[PDB]
């Protein structure tokens, strides 16, 4: 047949790429030698086109102007600090170690110095739980218990823009507008509504998948569709 | 809209033009590559064996 949609994707053509040239900033934690004396004043609050969440503009003591992953409750004028000796307040970044347990954190680093990887979407937050001299246990927004190096930096507070998922799109047009700001081909045509040549579920005189939907992990691209390596399906039991 | 006559009217774009190298009107001004001599793509002159019968 013909390569399915998922395969056309990888090629990275225009249709599948994210509008990078329209993106604001690669939100990452600042780099500090040590000391912590690094602090700055929030100069403005902006809209991040890549995340549909607000982002804060900050002007640092040493003159550097940069955008930062804004947690909820950060306004113009506020003073944020980043370093080992940073005060424990919302909007301040410091290695998990210096952070007191039981405090909601966002924009957590995977490996210390990576500038933040986990918990960065609208309204989410990681939960710092256990400390040590070797491991800092954080509970990510997916509920998973992640064992991190206490040296990994992180920002205090939940990510701004919480509750975005609460309101429905209502109409196709609204989706259209949001979709245009991401690396996604939209709308979505069902496999079952295509020709056999185009997708493994295509064909037939009526719309129904050929074989069962649960495919194996070892299935090749072009064939891995439907419910991937599903451990179970449905809602019963 | 017909793919024939009605779709011919929008054809006012310039692509292939007189080539600086070989002189043929095959220099695609948008690709900046000559379809006849290979100018713009190859230092060597575009030339294939299939441009003639195999035993010739």
């Amino acid at each position: 047949g013909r390569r399915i949609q998922g395969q056309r994707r990888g090629r990275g053509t225009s249709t599948f790429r994210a509008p990078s040239h329209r993106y604001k900033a690669d939100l990452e934690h600042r780099k500090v030698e040590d000391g912590d004396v690094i602090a700055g004043t929030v100069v403005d609050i902006e809209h991040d086109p890549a995340r549909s969440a607000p982002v804060a503009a900050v002007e640092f003591e040493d003159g550097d102007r940069r955008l930062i992953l804004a947690p909820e409750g950060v306004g113009v004028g506020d003073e944020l600090q980043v370093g080992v000796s940073a005060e424990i307040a919302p909007g301040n970044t410091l290695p998990l170690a210096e952070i007191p347990e039981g405090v909601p954190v966002c924009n957590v680093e995977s490996s210390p110095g990576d500038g933040g990887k986990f918990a960065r979407a609208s309204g989410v937050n990681a939960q710092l739980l256990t400390h040590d001299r070797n491991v800092a246990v954080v509970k990510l927004p997916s509920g998973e218990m992640k064992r991190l190096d206490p040296q990994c930096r992180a920002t205090i507070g939940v990510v701004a823009g919480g509750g975005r998922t609460d309101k429905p799109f209502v109409k196709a047009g609204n989706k259209h507008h949001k979709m245009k700001a991401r690396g996604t081909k939209w709308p979505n045509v069902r496999g079952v509504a295509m020709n056999a040549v185009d997708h493994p579920f295509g064909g037939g005189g009526r719309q129904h998948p050929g074989k069962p939907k649960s495919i194996s992990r070892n299935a090749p691209p072009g064939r891995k569709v439907g419910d991937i390596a599903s451990k179970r399906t449905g809602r019963g039991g | 809209t017909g793919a024939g006559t009605p779709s011919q009217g929008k054809k006012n774009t310039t692509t292939h033009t007189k080539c600086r190298r070989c002189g043929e009107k095959s220099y695609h001004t948008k690709k900046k590559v000559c379809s006849s001599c290979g100018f713009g793509k190859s230092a060597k002159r575009r030339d294939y064996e299939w441009q003639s019968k195999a035993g010739e």
Binding site: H47, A53, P54, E72, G75, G162, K167 | -
Partner: protein
């Protein structure tokens, strides 16, 4: 509210658009001062027409159940 939606979309969809938009448009207490002049500027962005405090909050509420938890700890 969802009156602009006419007879389209259905109950739930436009019922929740109204509720969310109703609370979104309410007078909100300014964190800077304490005045009821906080309005939405965009997605997650709020500002007081009184003191000009431009800050971050929820997408449709200047404060979310999660942000309120932060303070406590």
């Amino acid at each position: 509210r969802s009156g602009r939606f006419g007879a389209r979309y259905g109950r739930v969809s436009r019922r929740r658009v109204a509720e969310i938009e109703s609370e979104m448009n309410e007078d909100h207490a300014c964190p800077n001062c304490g005045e009821d002049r906080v309005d939405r500027q965009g997605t997650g962005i709020w500002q007081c027409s009184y003191c000009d405090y431009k800050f971050t909050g929820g997408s449709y509420k200047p404060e979310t159940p999660g942000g309120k938890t932060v303070r406590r700890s």
